[PDB]
């Protein structure tokens, strides 16, 4: 019984491997061996934001390129204005162990969650001058590690019980569940058309999910340890993954396999966050040896360094018009570079 | 500057004035993490110090006008190499062990080895509670189960000269107690570096002094931390 199923798995695995190998007729490095490089890239610190009492663990820009939300493990979400550094909102939470935050694409809500297995929604523009909790979404059986809005009435969450879910806010019930990972799910990324998404687990694996029918379309392997961050290429046909073995990689969807590996011979730390430039030429990445690195995404050569944090870098994000970069670390400070 | 800019600046000033108070309250409260296994009696210690669905529970007690918070994690899976990283800035970890269970003692030892040696938990002290002393006395005096069936080296062990067998107990109980204590103190001293220590205590299920012991140990931890600046 088990022998037949194991044999079936082995045969299908071998066939899929051979089918992928039959279509590998060139490598990205060779075809991109004739491009003039980008030279040295040097960036400067224009703002520094002070005010948290403990480490910072997440951050997210708005669709206006001007306002930020950030969150600390002392019980505070803070909404910042970056052109001047004025503070706009400071929201005290109920549980002080919080691991993620997100900002709505219209400017009217924020969300957060953590070791208590609940996602809480906060409504900003109310009839009074305050912010009031509107909803508490409960039903996961492990901590929340990421969440992203689709509109003002749907949200997607990933948790440490090895699942993902899609929630209807006005009702408070799960509209669909995405099961199939084996370890803890650690990150999400939404497609530009918001009809698919991708996720990566505490298992050297990533998966492509279709929202409408709740099925898994493809599986991608290649890393050697757990995956910590993920994001899409600007046109929506490739993505990049950073893992806990000192390596980023770039995968492509249509060809169904790996394209490039970004690694160095003197780097032996882990990776905490990744993101892309607006045209897709640069890839930024944050490490836990206190630093961030800027790579050339088409030739795989290091081009720059961001340095100036006294503790492990944890979050990192790039605006919707490409003007600025924001970093946050475990020493309680946010920095804006340009 | 127009009226809008001045109004924004005053709003930011109010937020700052509140954050100062929150800072003063936060800086004067101690935070503790409670760890153990299901057969350890961890809950009895919790309920005893409670006289001073969800994924985490909290217990608040106060001694001599100092406030302690104690955090206990429930309703999570049994893989813990990711959420444990959230606890790298507490004051102390409290580790509870059932000392009468010979079968599941090497697992407790392995847990201690992992907690002692992590990269993000290298500067945090441990308070160790070797629970259930009376059950250990009954088991040893019964004479039908032998410790050496799991640890051979007990056959070559003698009682230390700093023992304090105050209430006139049987000598065999004293040998057993101090052997089991030394098993954890070996791991404690093998790979420390002067950055964190371990404080062992014998205890049972009818004690009334665990809060005072935590008070004194936390006091000493803070004093060493202050002194370390003069090196």
């Amino acid at each position, epitope marked *: 019984e088990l022998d037949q199923l194991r044999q079936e798995a082995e045969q299908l695995k071998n066939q899929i491997r051979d089918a992928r190998k039959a279509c590998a007729d060139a490598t990205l490095s060779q075809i991109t061996n004739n491009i003039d490089p980008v030279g040295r890239i040097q960036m400067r610190t224009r703002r520094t934001l002070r005010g948290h009492l403990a480490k910072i663990y997440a951050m997210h820009w708005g669709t206006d390129s001007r306002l930020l939300v950030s969150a600390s493990q002392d019980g505070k979400l803070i909404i910042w204005d970056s052109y001047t550094t004025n503070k706009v909102h400071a929201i005290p939470l109920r549980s002080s162990w919080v691991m993620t935050c997100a900002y709505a694409p219209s400017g009217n809500y924020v969300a957060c969650g953590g070791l208590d297995n609940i996602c809480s929604i906060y409504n900003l523009k109310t009839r009074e001058g305050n912010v009031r909790v509107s909803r508490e979404l409960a039903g996961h059986t492990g901590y929340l590690s990421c969440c992203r809005f689709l509109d003002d009435n749907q949200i997607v969450t990933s948790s440490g019980d090895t699942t993902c879910a899609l929630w209807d806010i006005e009702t408070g019930q799960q509209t669909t569940t995405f099961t199939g990972h084996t370890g803890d799910v650690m990150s999400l990324s939404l497609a530009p058309d918001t009809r698919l998404f991708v996720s990566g687990a505490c298992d050297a694996s990533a998966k492509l999910w279709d929202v409408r029918e709740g099925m898994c379309r493809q599986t991608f392997t290649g890393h050697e340890s757990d995956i910590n961050a993920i994001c899409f290429f600007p046109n929506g046909n490739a993505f990049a993954t950073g893992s806990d*073995d000192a390596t980023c990689r770039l995968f492509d969807l249509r060809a169904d396999q790996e394209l490039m590996t970004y690694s160095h011979d003197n780097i032996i730390c882990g990776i905490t966050s990744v993101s892309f430039s607006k045209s897709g030429r640069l890839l930024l990445a944050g490490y836990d040896d206190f630093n961030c690195n800027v790579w050339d995404a088409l030739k795989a050569d290091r081009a720059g360094v961001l340095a100036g944090h006294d503790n492990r870098v944890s979050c990192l994000g790039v605006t919707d018009d490409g003007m600025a970069v924001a970093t946050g670390s475990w020493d309680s400070f946010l920095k804006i570079w340009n | 500057l127009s009226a809008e800019d001045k109004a924004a600046v005053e709003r930011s000033k109010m937020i700052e004035k509140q954050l100062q108070k929150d800072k003063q309250v936060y800086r004067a409260t101690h935070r503790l993490l409670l760890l153990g296994a299901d057969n350890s009696g961890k809950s009895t210690i919790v309920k005893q110090m409670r006289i001073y669905t969800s994924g985490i529970f909290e217990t608040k007690f106060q001694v001599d006008k100092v406030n302690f918070h104690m955090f206990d994690v429930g309703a999570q899976r049994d893989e813990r190499r990711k959420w444990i990283q959230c606890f790298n800035d507490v004051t102390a970890i409290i580790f509870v062990v059932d000392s009468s269970d010979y079968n599941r003692l090497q697992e407790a030892l392995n847990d201690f080895k992992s907690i002692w040696n992590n990269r993000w938990l290298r500067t945090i002290s441990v308070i160790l509670f070797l629970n259930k002393q009376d059950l250990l006395a009954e088991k040893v005096l019964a004479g039908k189960s032998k410790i050496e069936d799991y640890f051979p080296e007990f056959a070559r062990y003698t009682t230390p000269e700093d023992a304090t067998p105050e209430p006139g107990e049987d000598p065999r109980v004293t040998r057993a107690k101090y052997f089991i204590r030394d098993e954890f103190l070996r791991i404690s001293t093998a790979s420390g570096d002067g950055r964190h220590y371990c404080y062992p205590h014998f205890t049972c299920s009818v004690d009334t002094e665990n809060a005072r012991r935590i008070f004194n140990d936390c006091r000493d931890i803070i004093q060493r931390m202050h002194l370390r600046q003069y090196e």
Partner: nanobody
Amino acid sequence: QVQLQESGGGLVQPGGSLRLSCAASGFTFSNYKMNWVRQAPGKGLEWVSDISQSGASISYTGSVKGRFTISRDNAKNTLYLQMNSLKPEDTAVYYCARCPAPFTRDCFDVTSTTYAYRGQGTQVTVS
């Protein structure tokens, strides 16, 4: 694609011996610390022995101390366990496990129920 495959189990009489071996694939072998665990009919998972990256540090559990030996080969990418004088309490299903991250002294989560970097195991019977 991480892969670990154990081989060498079987059925022996008391006082006999055998030798288990894991063949590994999909990662740099000599970056990681390796372990042997086991499960017996009616209990949970129990840690048996441990070896480091170079072969210079070795550790055992109490009940097997003078009898089992652990060793590794970084050229063929393989682990060996030698079991010498066996008792009817040694019958079990044996598994081969890898530490989660490289270049590390600790080892979280090797005995848990569902672990990603563990093999399929082999059956050993003493009778």
